[PDB]
Design a protein around this ligand. Structure first.
Ligand SMILES: [Mg+2]
Ligand SMILES: [Mg+2]
Ligand SMILES: [Mg+2]
Ligand SMILES: [Mg+2]
Ligand SMILES: [Mg+2]
Ligand SMILES: [Mg+2]
Ligand SMILES: [Mg+2]
Ligand SMILES: [Mg+2]
Ligand SMILES: [Mg+2]
Ligand SMILES: [Mg+2]
Ligand SMILES: [Mg+2]
Ligand SMILES: [Mg+2]
Ligand SMILES: [Mg+2]
Ligand SMILES: [Mg+2]
Ligand SMILES: [Mg+2]
Ligand SMILES: [Mg+2]
Ligand SMILES: [Mg+2]
Ligand SMILES: [Mg+2]
Ligand SMILES: [Mg+2]
Ligand SMILES: [Mg+2]
Ligand SMILES: [Mg+2]
Ligand SMILES: [Mg+2]
Ligand SMILES: [Mg+2]
Ligand SMILES: [Mg+2]
Ligand SMILES: [Mg+2]
Ligand SMILES: [Mg+2]
Ligand SMILES: [Mg+2]
Ligand SMILES: [Mg+2]
Ligand SMILES: [Mg+2]
Ligand SMILES: [Mg+2]
Ligand SMILES: [Mg+2]
Ligand SMILES: [Mg+2]
Ligand SMILES: [Mg+2]
Ligand SMILES: [Mg+2]
Ligand SMILES: [Mg+2]
Ligand SMILES: [Mg+2]
Ligand SMILES: [Mg+2]
Ligand SMILES: [Zn+2]
Lengths: 113, 112, 50, 46, 206, 65, 98, 156
RNA sequence: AUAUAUUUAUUAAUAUAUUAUCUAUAUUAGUUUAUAUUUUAAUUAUUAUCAUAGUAGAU
RNA sequence: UGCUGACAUGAGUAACGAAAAAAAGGUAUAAACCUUUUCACCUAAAACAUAAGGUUUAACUAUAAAAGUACGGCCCCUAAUUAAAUUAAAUAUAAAUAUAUUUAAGAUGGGAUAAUCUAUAUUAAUAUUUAUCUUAAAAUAUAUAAUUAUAUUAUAUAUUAUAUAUUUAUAUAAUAUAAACUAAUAAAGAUCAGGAAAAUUAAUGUAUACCGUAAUGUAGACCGACUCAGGUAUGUAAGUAGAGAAUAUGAAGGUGAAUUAGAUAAUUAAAGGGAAGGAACUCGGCAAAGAUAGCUCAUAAGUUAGUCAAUAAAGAGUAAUAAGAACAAAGUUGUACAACUGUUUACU
């Protein structure tokens, strides 16, 4: 513990002026540096393509199809099994993938809703 | 330490309401405010007039809001891209509806 | 809502129990529904099962 | 020495001791499970 | 054993000249978790670099994790000489220090605040730090060229990250230099084969 | 106050509605120890290495033709 | 210390001051005096120091002259053990020290 | 000759040049996939060169990439995966508690940028108009949680 | 150093106001300290806080 | 002392759970929410990283981003141990089952490569515990090759200058603080004698899967019925001081709270001081008071010879003479019982 009797410690052993090495780095940062306001990134530099494949998840580039934009229930019908039965394999496969695409579009929208 | 009996209706009521100490008193010491002719307490400032003066002071002695240049001159689309919206929590929503839990000062009656 | 319930079928048994309420406690179930709904929405006729 | 905090959770231990598969694996545990099923229990094990 | 690597110390121009691991350039790294930026003399970095930069951390500007996945290269800036690159790096570090410790109130005033007076955030991601780093980079470069052949260039991760080529980045000094604002080629996994891409870039300008 | 609209002590919790509940409910990926690995039926793809790595087996990888 | 007061142990300077040959040592599995039930059958046995049982040749079959290379401390027996080395064969083995 | 990461990068570049897959296609041919993906709006932490999806919980990172390539024609260069936690929910305190679903969300990095179309005004779109359902919810809350003399209290 | 005024032939000199006394590199891994280098990076008057009212003498 | 429900009484009584707050403004809505400034409290923590746990409580639904190198799981490997498993006839057994052996599981442990970045696949072929002393070496000064006194003494890197392969490589020389601390090295003292388990060349490969990642974690987010002065694992833990992680302060960071404002009777608690006296108190000096160095000296009778007694009591040096931070340090003896360090009625 520190006490009335504690004599102060000696100063650290400095290396002489002649013996000390010169530092490897001499010239440091500029003193003139100034805190400028930030520069927020802009959409102007982008060139988002009109046929970017992620537009395929939308429908007519709409954030959401309105009631009028949607196909009405009376006009639309699902496929009949008999109708499907006389379609080729490749055609059926294409139809399936179109269906899946449509679901994805709706799923995105449905989730948002 | 413990009550020996169910205290009766009479004895609890005469205890509570019988003494004048325990009763509420009429506030006889109301009087007219000179700035607006309304009720106020005696030897007290009118809370309307002092509030108005405080409001005036605020409007005049107003520290200007810091609007950063770069955010003030953003495009709308660019701003939307950078700083999109979010769902606030239930707690946050509750905090936002201040009128639910925060009492604004009522005006007194006009003196005759 | 902020739900995520719609992308799954979680707590399935509980949902079944709620969905298939016994018919003798149907008045109990619908009393509170009626209360909840505004006048312009609510209907007098009984919502029959599928 | 204050009591009350005799439960000291540790998921792994719980699953070893009171988990469904532990019950299934033992004969006694299987009997318990059956008994719970008969009763009508929604939750047979941890 | 050999403890120190190239990254383990600050390396001056003379050291770079002796070695020639990379050309004269400085690397800049976004933090995907918090939005904080990390400058470095090399395409890799260690905890030491993080400690050096993130000296006064708080709830708003937390000391970032050293986990490799959340760090991603914002910008690779090439210069005319090793010494020049070193000077730029020093300037950036100085600017960071000023923003965190010395001239912190001014920096705070400059930033975007939300309602309830906090520096705008989404989660713990704060998009002001990146912006500041771009502004700070611009400042440091400008100072270097004031202090002051290969045409210098700044290979960007993303062209969007520029504030505006008219409002900023069109100083007379930069124009005189021929400061080409290129971008890194994204014909591959940019995050995963990042180091390879950086090596390829380094090779290109030598 | 935890929430400024509730000045006085109602029996409301610090978070949520009830502390108690059915503990016996299946584990998820988030729960358990460091060693607890649930998995999500996503990767019976390749093979685990002797050293702890992983080696994809492309004949057992899902393409969508 | 008062615990030291009555601590006597016989000094054997010729005794080996190194580890035993690792090929001739198996782990000495502790039991706490518990049998296959898991119940304490033998009382008063418990957590000692860790040990290795040493595989010492009681049968003494091979034959031929063998030189005692060293004599060791063995933690699982009161006797010392002697590391023999077969002169012809070169095979190494432990034996109760005479 | 060259290291592994470099080889991978070279392969990816070659695939890009081809207009073939920028990745080794698997052998487990799924002709009729039933998986759907939900394209999400971008967070502040992401760039215009990223897109995030809700995907199947049993969807692989490689699988997702394959799906994006073949179904849509988009090539995701880098993919991350964020399996979310399932917080406990219950209809009321009388019911049993259970977790909401753990939901998998995969960010992708892509070589061309993309920004969403701007969300519609209240007057424009019928569905995207949160006033009505929120009002209805509020009314329900009022009516069920109305007790005594708050029945007389006028509606909000 | 910046900002505002005055002189001088934007520059320097003066006056007032505000802010600053940091930083970076060397000495064989790390930390601290020391010195050197780097930088404009100051030493006197007078206060305050904390240490049982910090302790003590009076009051 | 019936059961269930409802509602009284005590009573608008106690209490509101260790706590430092003030103003201005958000807002002519705020003791309680947010901001700014001031003030305070924690600071080998009330900080910063984490483990376990949990109603996701988070800076939130537009949500916690990994091929691997001071990244974990998963995987390989096994310990303790576990297994309606394993072997005309493994052995035993009223049934259940139990035993032995195999195999399989089983982390709290072991596991290749890596910034000059690194490549894990397939096929073929033959380490208890503690210690770093003394000597010796050379270096720096005094005195007259040798003596005396003092530090230094295995490793960790940049610079400069040489010699060989050809500005990239290898080796040599010289230049360069103190005090802690790390890892890796070497040599080695003690008895209590110190885990288990999973090959190498060559050719051909490698498009790098899944899960964890928020915040909270000496706590309002876990275990204690409560936002409970309890319980809860690990690592950093600014400097100044010191033998030190003691003690004081507190740079930074975090915090100032589901109670406030006043008044401060009697009385209680937790503190501070006290004339003259000094155990007269009391079952009993219970409680309180009492420390004239903590470093360096010095230190008795007895005694089982162990500075056991001893940290002896007293006492000295340094410091201080009117005193003037905290913390460590609180007498001497006789007898009964028990050798001693230990263990015991978790809650008398
Ligand atoms: Mg209990
Ligand atoms: Mg157990
Ligand atoms: Mg990587
Ligand atoms: Mg319970
Ligand atoms: Mg967990
Ligand atoms: Mg891994
Ligand atoms: Mg015995
Ligand atoms: Mg992951
Ligand atoms: Mg060093
Ligand atoms: Mg100065
Ligand atoms: Mg303090
Ligand atoms: Mg009765
Ligand atoms: Mg009373
Ligand atoms: Mg009272
Ligand atoms: Mg009271
Ligand atoms: Mg106010
Ligand atoms: Mg302490
Ligand atoms: Mg923390
Ligand atoms: Mg195994
Ligand atoms: Mg382990
Ligand atoms: Mg965590
Ligand atoms: Mg974290
Ligand atoms: Mg709890
Ligand atoms: Mg209790
Ligand atoms: Mg507590
Ligand atoms: Mg300290
Ligand atoms: Mg402070
Ligand atoms: Mg905290
Ligand atoms: Mg309190
Ligand atoms: Mg007295
Ligand atoms: Mg006196
Ligand atoms: Mg008496
Ligand atoms: Mg006492
Ligand atoms: Mg004597
Ligand atoms: Mg003491
Ligand atoms: Mg005794
Ligand atoms: Mg007791
Ligand atoms: Zn008035």
């Amino acid at each position: 513990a520190r006490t009335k009797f504690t004599k102060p410690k000696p100063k650290q052993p400095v290396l002489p002026k002649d013996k000390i090495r010169p530092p490897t780095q001499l010239t440091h940062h500029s003193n003139n540096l100034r805190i400028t306001e930030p520069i927020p990134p802009t959409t102007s530099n982008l060139r988002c393509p009109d046929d970017h494949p992620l537009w395929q998840f939308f429908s007519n580039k709409k954030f959401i199809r309105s009631a009028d934009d949607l196909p009405p229930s009376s006009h639309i019908r699902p496929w009949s099994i008999p109708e499907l039965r006389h379609k080729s394999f490749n055609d059926l496969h294409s139809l399936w993938y179109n269906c899946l695409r449509e679901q994805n579009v709706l799923a995105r929208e449905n989730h948002l809703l | 330490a413990v009550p020996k009996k169910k205290v009766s209706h009479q004895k609890k009521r005469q205890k509570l309401y019988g003494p004048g100490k325990k009763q509420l008193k009429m506030i006889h010491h109301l009087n007219k405010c000179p700035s607006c002719g309304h009720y106020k307490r005696a030897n007290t400032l009118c809370m309307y007039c002092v509030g108005q003066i405080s409001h005036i002071w605020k409007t005049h002695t107003a520290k200007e809001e810091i609007k950063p240049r770069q955010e003030e001159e953003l495009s709308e689309l660019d701003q939307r891209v950078l700083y999109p919206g979010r769902r606030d929590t239930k707690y946050t929503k509750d905090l936002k509806d201040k009128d639910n839990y925060l009492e604004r000062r009522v005006r007194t009656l006009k003196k005759d | 809502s902020g739900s995520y319930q719609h992308l799954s079928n979680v707590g399935s048994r509980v949902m079944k129990r709620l969905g298939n309420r016994p018919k003798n406690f149907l008045p109990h179930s619908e009393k509170f529904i009626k209360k909840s709904t505004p006048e312009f929405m609510k209907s007098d006729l009984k919502e029959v099962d599928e | 020495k204050s009591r009350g905090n005799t439960y000291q959770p540790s998921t792994l231990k719980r699953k070893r001791t009171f988990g469904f598969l532990a019950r299934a694996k033992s004969k006694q545990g299987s009997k318990i499970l059956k008994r719970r099923k008969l009763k009508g229990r929604w939750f047979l094990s941890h | 054993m050999k403890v120190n690597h190239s990254i383990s110390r600050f390396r001056p121009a003379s050291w770079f000249e002796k070695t020639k691991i990379i050309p004269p350039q400085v690397y800049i790294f976004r933090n995907l978790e918090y939005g904080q930026v990390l400058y470095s003399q090399f395409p890799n970095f260690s905890q030491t670099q993080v400690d050096k930069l993130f000296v006064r951390p708080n709830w708003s500007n937390r000391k970032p994790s050293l986990r490799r996945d959340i760090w991603k290269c914002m910008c690779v800036v090439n210069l005319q000489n090793y010494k020049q690159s070193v000077h730029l790096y020093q300037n950036l570090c100085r600017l960071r220090y000023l923003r965190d410790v010395a001239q912190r109130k001014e920096s705070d005033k400059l930033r975007k605040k939300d309602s309830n007076g906090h520096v705008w955030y989404s989660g713990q991601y704060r998009p002001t730090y990146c912006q500041e780093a771009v502004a700070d980079l611009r400042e440091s470069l400008l100072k270097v060229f004031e202090n002051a052949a290969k045409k210098p260039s700044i290979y960007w991760e993303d062209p969007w990250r520029m504030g505006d080529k008219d409002k900023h980045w069109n100083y007379d000094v930069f124009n005189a230099l021929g400061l080409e604002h290129k971008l890194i080629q994204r014909v591959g996994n940019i995050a995963r084969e990042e180091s390879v891409i950086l090596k390829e870039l380094a090779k290109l300008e030598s | 106050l935890t929430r400024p609209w509730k000045k006085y002590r109602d029996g409301e919790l610090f978070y949520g509605l009830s502390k108690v509940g059915n503990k016996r409910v299946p584990l998820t990926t988030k729960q358990g120890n460091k060693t607890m690995y649930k998995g999500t039926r996503a990767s019976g793809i390749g093979r685990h290495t002797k050293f702890g790595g992983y080696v994809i087996n492309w004949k057992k990888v899902r393409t969508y033709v | 210390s008062p615990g030291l007061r009555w601590y006597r142990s016989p000094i054997y300077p010729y005794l080996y001051k190194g580890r035993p040959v690792r090929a001739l040592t198996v782990v000495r599995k502790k039991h706490g005096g518990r049998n296959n039930s898991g119940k304490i059958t033998v009382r008063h046995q418990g957590g000692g120091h860790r040990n290795r049982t040493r595989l010492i040749d009681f049968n003494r079959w091979e034959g031929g002259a063998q030189t005692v290379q060293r004599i060791e401390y063995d933690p699982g027996r009161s006797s010392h053990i002697a590391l023999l080395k077969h002169n012809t064969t070169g095979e190494l083995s432990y034996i109760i020290a005479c | 000759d060259i290291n592994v990461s470099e080889k991978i990068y070279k392969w990816t570049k070659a695939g890009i040049e081809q207009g073939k897959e920028h990745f080794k296609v698997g052998g487990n041919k799924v002709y009729f996939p039933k998986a759907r993906i939900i394209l999400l709006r971008p967070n502040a932490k992401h760039t215009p060169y990223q897109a995030k999806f809700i995907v199947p919980k049993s969807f692989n990172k490689l699988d997702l990439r394959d799906y994006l390539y073949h179904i849509y024609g988009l090539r995701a260069m880098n993919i991350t995966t964020q399996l979310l936690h399932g917080k406990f929910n219950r209809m009321n305190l009388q019911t049993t508690r259970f977790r909401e679903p753990q939901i998998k969300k995969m960010t992708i990095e892509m070589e061309e940028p993309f920004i969403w179309p701007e969300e519609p005004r209240p007057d424009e779109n019928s569905f995207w108009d949160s006033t009505t359902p929120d009002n209805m919810e509020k009314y329900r809350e009022e009516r069920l949680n109305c007790l005594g003399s708050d029945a007389n209290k006028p509606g909000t």
